[PDB]
Design a protein around this nucleic acid. Sequence first.
RNA 1: AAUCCGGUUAAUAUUCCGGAACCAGAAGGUGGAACACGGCAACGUAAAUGAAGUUGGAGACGUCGGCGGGAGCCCUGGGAAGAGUUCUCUUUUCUUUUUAACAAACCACACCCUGAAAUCGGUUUAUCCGGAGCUAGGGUAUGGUGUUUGGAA
Lengths: 105, 70, 134, 97
Amino acid sequence: QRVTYRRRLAYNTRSNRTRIIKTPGNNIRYLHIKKLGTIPRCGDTGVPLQGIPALRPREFARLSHNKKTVQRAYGGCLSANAVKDRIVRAFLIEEQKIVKQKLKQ
Amino acid sequence: PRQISDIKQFLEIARRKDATSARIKKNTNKDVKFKLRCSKYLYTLVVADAKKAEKLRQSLPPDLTVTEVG
Amino acid sequence: KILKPGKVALITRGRFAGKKVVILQAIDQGSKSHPFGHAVVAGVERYPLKVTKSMGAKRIARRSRVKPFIKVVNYNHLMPTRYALELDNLKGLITADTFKEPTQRSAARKTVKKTFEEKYQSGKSAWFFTPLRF
Amino acid sequence: GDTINSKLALTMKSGKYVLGYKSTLKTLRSGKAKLILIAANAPPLRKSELEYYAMLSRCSVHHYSGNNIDLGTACGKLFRVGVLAVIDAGDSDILAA
RNA sequence: AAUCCGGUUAAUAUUCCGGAACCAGAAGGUGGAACACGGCAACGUAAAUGAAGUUGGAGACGUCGGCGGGAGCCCUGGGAAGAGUUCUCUUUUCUUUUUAACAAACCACACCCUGAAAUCGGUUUAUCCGGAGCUAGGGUAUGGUGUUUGGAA
């Protein structure tokens, strides 16, 4: 059969997103399902992170710290390649810093 | 609703003061479904043997309200 | 020849990423459980804090306390460095039995932590003891 | 220049060489890499990474004028090579050059 | 930030009823937890101190095309119930045959480890990947998914 919106809001938009169900009473209805979550992304290079769920921030607040972080330095905010990039940079330019300071002294 | 498989834990949820009522269901496959109503979750236990169905029934504390086939 | 016992290196990945460790033993020849250039190295998971004279003795000891961690790392995953620390205690104390037995591993970690604390008190290997910012 | 390219071709034809970054890093760690060539178009981070390992392992480092494609064409392979190492020069005398 | 199913009225239903869940805030009690560990690693756990200060991400986003998946509708076989047809042939014709939110476990695009490739290999419907590591093997994570159950007959 033919269904109607559950809410009083017509005009299917970015927030008026619906899904068909078959009820236990053999009736077809809409459930206004919500916008899907997106995994947070890397600030260093932009690739989305790995190992953490795709959610909206409000149900991020319900997650646990260990479901949230990646157990490493700069984790949860930088990716594996990003944290690799920081540490190799950290090493090579202090090598460069110490060699030039030996040159000047 | 949580599905509980370990018998003893279902006993210890029943002994917990949060438990209010338990339901006994007889299915067509001769499985009995012990459905314990708790505050947040409905814990269900499916035991296949009819006699473990019975020695479970009175091992439930008498204060808890058991209910026949719902 | 670049990898020898007592050579200080840095870890590139894992939980202890960007951490300075000392190569206790080299197994570059390979092993059944470790079929690569795995080297057992003990590093510091919590670098010692800045000790203040005005601070109490207990606070200074807590700040100087270093929690070590001994683990195997790949040659590719390890970054060699110029500095080297010839720790007598952290030389040959790591073996297959130490890695397998948990109690032996805990005892080895405690011994390594004690050696690191003694080195910090003596003021040796300052570069290795000081954490490196990324 | 041209003599270096000719020596590199002779080394690739006779001696042992690894035209790969991971292979060169392994050779540098083992200390068997006498000489290494780094493409000009290679990223500065990778170039410095190879330079630090070369200095630690006491290995000669030469910066090729051409890019990765030019280095691959000089090596004769069908794919561009950003870095290469020559463990043995064979008949070539590129170790001195 | 957060609700679904069934029923109820002459007139109200995601609001009332019965059942089953979710979110936010607030304090405590009991038990377990001890400035924690195990995995070389892609990580993981019931816990796994964080005063100030510093920092980033999600939220936070255009348009077209193809591909594959799912859900509902449509088509359809076997079976079951009811109704129509009949001397004849028709195991016929028509109607009905349902499983919500919410939970639990299990369960492949990206990454890593071993590996070091050309004899160039893998490989998209639509030739891209690779000396910035190939094929292969083994893991890692987002797991609408369905694989069963709860709800729930």
